[PDB]
Amino acid sequence: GLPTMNTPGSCQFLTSDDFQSPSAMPQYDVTPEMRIPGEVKNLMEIAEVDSVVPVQNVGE
Amino acid sequence: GLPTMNTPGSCQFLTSDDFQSPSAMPQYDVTPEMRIPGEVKNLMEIAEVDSVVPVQNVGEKVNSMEAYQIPVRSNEGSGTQVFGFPLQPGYSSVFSRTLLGEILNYYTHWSGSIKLTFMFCGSAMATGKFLLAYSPPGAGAPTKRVDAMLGTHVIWDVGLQSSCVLCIPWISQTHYRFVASDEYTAGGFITCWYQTNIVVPADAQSSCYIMCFVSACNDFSVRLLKDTPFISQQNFFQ
Amino acid sequence: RVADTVGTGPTNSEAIPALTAAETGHTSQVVPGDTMQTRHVKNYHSRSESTIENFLCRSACVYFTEYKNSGAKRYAEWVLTPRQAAQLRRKLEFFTYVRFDLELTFVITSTQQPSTTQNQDAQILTHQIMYVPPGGPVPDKVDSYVWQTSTNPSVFWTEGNAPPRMSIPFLSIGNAYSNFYDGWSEFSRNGVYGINTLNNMGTLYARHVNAGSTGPIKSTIRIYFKPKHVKAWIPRPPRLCQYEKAKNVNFQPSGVTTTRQSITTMTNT
Amino acid sequence: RVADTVGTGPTNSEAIPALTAAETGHTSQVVPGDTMQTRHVKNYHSRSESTIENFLCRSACVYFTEYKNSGAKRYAEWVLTPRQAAQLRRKLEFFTYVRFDLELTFVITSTQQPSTTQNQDAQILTHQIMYVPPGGPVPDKVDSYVWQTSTNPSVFWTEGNAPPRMSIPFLSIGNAYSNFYDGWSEFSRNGVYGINTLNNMGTLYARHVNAGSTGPIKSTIRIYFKPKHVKAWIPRPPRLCQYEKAKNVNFQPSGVTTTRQSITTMTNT
Amino acid sequence: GAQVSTQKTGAIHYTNINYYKDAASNSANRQDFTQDPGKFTEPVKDIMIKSLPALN
Amino acid sequence: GAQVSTQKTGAIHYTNINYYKDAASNSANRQDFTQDPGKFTEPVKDIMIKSLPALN
Amino acid sequence: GYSDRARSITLGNSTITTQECANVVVGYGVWPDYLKDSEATAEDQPTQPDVATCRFYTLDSVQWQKTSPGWWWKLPDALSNLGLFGQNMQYHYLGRTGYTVHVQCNASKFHQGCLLVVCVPEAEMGCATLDNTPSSAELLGGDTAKEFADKPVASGSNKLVQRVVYNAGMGVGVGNLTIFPHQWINLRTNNSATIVMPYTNSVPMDNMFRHNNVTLMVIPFVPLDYCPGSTTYVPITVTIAPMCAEYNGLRLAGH
Amino acid sequence: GYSDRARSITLGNSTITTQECANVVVGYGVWPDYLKDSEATAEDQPTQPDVATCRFYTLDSVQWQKTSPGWWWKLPDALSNLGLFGQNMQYHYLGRTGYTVHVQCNASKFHQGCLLVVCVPEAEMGCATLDNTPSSAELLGGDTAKEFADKPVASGSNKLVQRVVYNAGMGVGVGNLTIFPHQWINLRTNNSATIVMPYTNSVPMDNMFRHNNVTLMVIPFVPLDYCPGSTTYVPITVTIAPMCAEYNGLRLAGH
Ligand SMILES: O=C(O)c1ccc(NS(=O)(=O)c2ccc(N3C(=O)c4ccccc4C3=O)cc2)cc1
Ligand SMILES: O=C(O)c1ccc(NS(=O)(=O)c2ccc(N3C(=O)c4ccccc4C3=O)cc2)cc1
């Protein structure tokens, strides 16, 4: 026995948590990796590109 | 006290988990070890062995030893089709009960080459040549030898060494394929045609036989385990 | 960690870092210093909470079904797709190809159903959530041999504890999940359109292990997906018009923007 | 980690790695390169999720029984055998001899039984699952001295907690469990056929410790087996025809394959 | 081994040990900072230098 | 002691310490990779070499 | 060398020179090259078409009206007629390609207008009927330009594609299509667009007569406009060239 | 030395030479050898029969008809009559053996047919009645070949074995029996099968007059066939030789 006292915060599920996990099928061998062109690693890669602004508006 | 907060995932039992455990009777001394012949350590040891394919099916050619033999006879016009079945193990009703296919039905994926050894069990004076062709999916199976040639074929010339291995190579657009039927991926068509009709002298039977064997290659792997559909039960065995 | 501004000062030489055709498909980089003069400003702002992973790694509810514990539908069934919830779907459809592992958490909550049954008392319903890989067996009656979980994974969860969690690795025939597939499955180009076998992780069935209370109880399995270890390639426009189908990109045409008054108005309607 | 393909090219010498009798009981190894030419292809595919252990180490339900908490059968009894479920049994019968440890997990779920009893309220039933080694004492009445668990292992589990788990080591008179025994136990070759004492780990009895609610409650003990530390020898054909008995290999003859049309048809019926 | 790395600070140290057999069950890689906008922005063959007009 | 070994990766590190007296209560040996098809395949006395026919 | 108005792309036999234009837009930063062994999923031996399936195949010209909706040509299905590219995709199960999509349109210096030339990989089009998929004869070209419309396509039981310029037939705002490699053909100055597509797919090689990996869309954002008289027929001509073609699995002729 | 058509297996006094055949199939990769002290469960002193219980005991010949179902001979119970092997198993409680199962069948070069020669360790046969076990006089031979049938054995209260070629009397597909060491006797060329069984059991030594560790099955997959006339009686003769016999616990004669 290793004494522990559960701090409040336990037995809940957040929608933004991040933890270790139990696997489903264990020892599954994931498919290889291809270097498919145009990899994205940050949203600022996408946000720094021009897009046409629809400045004019009336009703049609 | 050592503070801990139980992450969600606790207090459940999976059917594929793996953990330490409390023992029952503690300090039990397990029996010794014998080196009994023929140890298995991988399913690919079993899957790379030949098994007879029951290519022929009709309705009573599926309840006898007529299933395994492929009828070959001398027909005057050459370009007649000997057999033809798609390559789609673990779904195809030709490989559904073979050794390779039965291991395959416990897996969802498969990848690797497959060897189809055809063994001529005719007379010892009967001859014949066959054009064994595998045509990848790109069209809906040849209906003539002149179309089958274009695929990946191997002309088998008989006369000693009564088997010839047509090795089907991996042609797929993905690194795995489904064992269960799908139409994003398919496995093409395996056909056999007469290259040069069966020439049989006198006093020798003019109807011979071929046997088809299915085996896995050494570039073969299966991934993602599921459980078979070809076994069933109702009530428990009393 | 973002970039920093540096002192400039007047400019009267032929440099014009402003004037440059944007007709060449090149999005020019212009700093404050180019259109005015701005001294050395240090920025400590961080462009982290904007990473591809952190963006997508948030648990979103993809679905929920209901199943009576005593009646007809004693089990629910779901073909796994993120295409059942608008919220998660639009985030994924911001990339053409994505690769990731999944964390499936199930939040099962039970509700008693009105009935005239006498002495209704529950004895802690236990739920079974079972994953059936693609091309598995399919249960019918809830007592079928299929539920023996011979090889098929399953989480057994007693009610009133931390919700069940399990991981799934990256399972795809290809090397990425395609969020948009232009093509058919059939070589004759008919049938289903973009119903390719790469984003079809079989079915997930759930049912009550026990017979619960004497009366009827209806339980609601809510499915949560959380993308871990994400790598996303080829960015693409976010969806504009509302979704119509769970396997097609069908839509009804609608506005290009929200309307306002004139071209020179300074206040949105 | 699987093997790799290497460049070949044309072949016009007397090698013929294709033509070779398969009449010698030798399964020849032929690569792509032998029947065509295929360049150097690297394969990173992994033949792990196909290991003997990983195959068999999946928890499968072997059985389940029911026992009233107030009436007649207040206890259940089971002679341990994996031969009660088709699913697990067929996997084990893919090997002639297997050696392994067991992890027994019991998923006990209670269901209230319809009755006209007044004020039925449970006070958290506690279940006792007891392992009785082969040649132990046998309980009758549920109050028998046998249930004192003097030396016999037992798990005491209060309902509404993580399901009980216990390990059993490899217990066999021999050095492997025989999944197929050809022989009798009697020297005169009569009686039981292949009911050898090597796969007979005694009995497992279970009952309600407490008297539960005033009314009747029926509980359902579901037994799960999970083979750890597996070593399997001598491979053998998987079962074809359906199982008929839990201790014999009795069967009714059935098809050799699923039927189709002609020998040259390209579509399964 | 125990992987120790700084907590994401604005302007320290946490032990983390993977406990599962698969590497598909490890916690997300929330920290993974890289930026390289020379892709979608400015995909041109010959980079336009900011000191003269792009066209002649 | 703590046994540290790589997680099964496709193409890292987990502590694991056995906590029970028996060695029949340790977690399964899911990682245990070996292949040796020179058994059931090709059980022949004299190995047939791929360059000539098996029979004379 | 001197002015950047000049460019000259020689692939095999055909050369496209242009007197005046701008820079070549290279992919996402990748130029199409052959697939290496560490990506090769095929186990068979691939062919090398080289120069004989790398010439600039000049697709159908379409006439830009004063007000015109826009156009699109699918990429493996605009070349399924022309030359040896149309042969090879049919005799081979798998194919892998890159492109040089060069859209050329000239105009006088008294004309104005502005095309957006984008190349949308994986353009999965919606449908007028909100529960039916497109047909394969409306959705695809035949090397012909399919054109959109400026009014919603009316719903019924029809399987005709939903075609509205402003939603691009995909249900995404037209103004956001610029993420994808592109260029503009502003008639004021700059008379061609060159977009070098590298092979983009989730799998290393895929059948091309069932899957269309790229879709070129040419959308006029500023309508063609001019004064009375002059010329009134400014066509847009598309010249596409396969680049680094590679096939596998030599089957037989099919669909 | 020269052709591989030749083979010659000398064990003790009897030699089996064959003019034409193929390779010897060695077990699972193990050749029968004596049990070492690190496997010896017996505490008593074993005998050494040596050459006098290692000769090729020629069991009953059976005649292959044009269409014939197949045959099987249990292994410790086909030799329970012949020579000193039949004595020793009865005077000794424990026994340990390996085998050289050599099935020989000749045919002319105008005959065709093909036998599968497998050796199934632990062949536990089913029964026609789905709740009764086999008898010990139908299930076992007496050194005689028991033959299957091509039609299901009708159910009743009978304890006769379920005998159907295609299920092999075990309820496994006949076509999958090839895992086990075997060989084929294709009459086209190759006129014998040699299968060297090493001792296979879960325990190191076991009684042989109550347990049958191996079952030889000879199943014709391609029926014997020929033209009218010629010879019409091609027998199959089985020669089995114990190999590395070892006994313990010298009791008295029994059953
Ligand atoms: O959950 C599964 O694993 C499981 C549930 C249903 C199932 N399908 S079955 O093979 O049709 C089957 C159907 C019913 C029973 N069964 C009974 O009929 C019964 C009566 C009384 C006590 C116990 C039981 C019991 O198990 C056993 C098996 C298999 C496994
Ligand atoms: O659970 C077991 O360990 C246990 C249960 C029953 C048992 N069998 S017995 O030896 O027949 C036995 C039978 C009954 C009682 N017993 C009573 O009759 C009683 C009356 C009032 C209070 C307590 C008790 C009580 O224990 C004690 C022993 C032994 C042990």
Author numbering:
A (entry chain C): 1 to 60
B (entry chain C): 1 to 238
C (entry chain A), D (entry chain A): 13 to 281
E (entry chain D), F (entry chain D): 2 to 12, 25 to 69
G (entry chain B), H (entry chain B): 8 to 262
Publication text:
Rhino- and enteroviruses (family Picornaviridae) are important human pathogens. The best studied inhibitors are the so-called “capsid binders” (such as pleconaril, pirodavir, vapendavir, and pocapavir). These compounds fit in a hydrophobic pocket in the viral particle, thereby preventing binding of the virus to the receptor and/or uncoating. Now 32 years after its discovery, we report on a novel druggable pocket within a conserved VP1-VP3 interprotomer interface of the viral capsid.
To gain insights into the interaction of the drug with the viral capsid, a 4.0-Å structure of the CVB3–compound 17 complex was determined by cryo–electron microscopy (EM) and image reconstruction. However, difference map analysis revealed additional density that could easily be fitted with an atomic model of compound 17. The compound has an L-shaped structure with a longer and a shorter arm, allowing unambiguous docking. Modelling revealed that compound 17 binds into a pocket formed by two VP1 units and one VP3 unit at an interprotomer interface. Because of the icosahedrally symmetric nature of the virus, there are 60 such sites in one capsid, with 5 around each 5-fold vertex. This interprotomer site is 16 Å away from the hydrophobic pocket targeted by pleconaril and other capsid inhibitors, raising the possibility of complementary antiviral effects (for those strains susceptible to both classes of compounds). The cryo-EM structure indicates that there is charge complementarity between R3 and the conserved residue VP1_R234. Hence, we propose that binding of compounds in this pocket stabilizes the conformation of a key region of the virion, preventing rearrangements that allow transition to the A-particle.
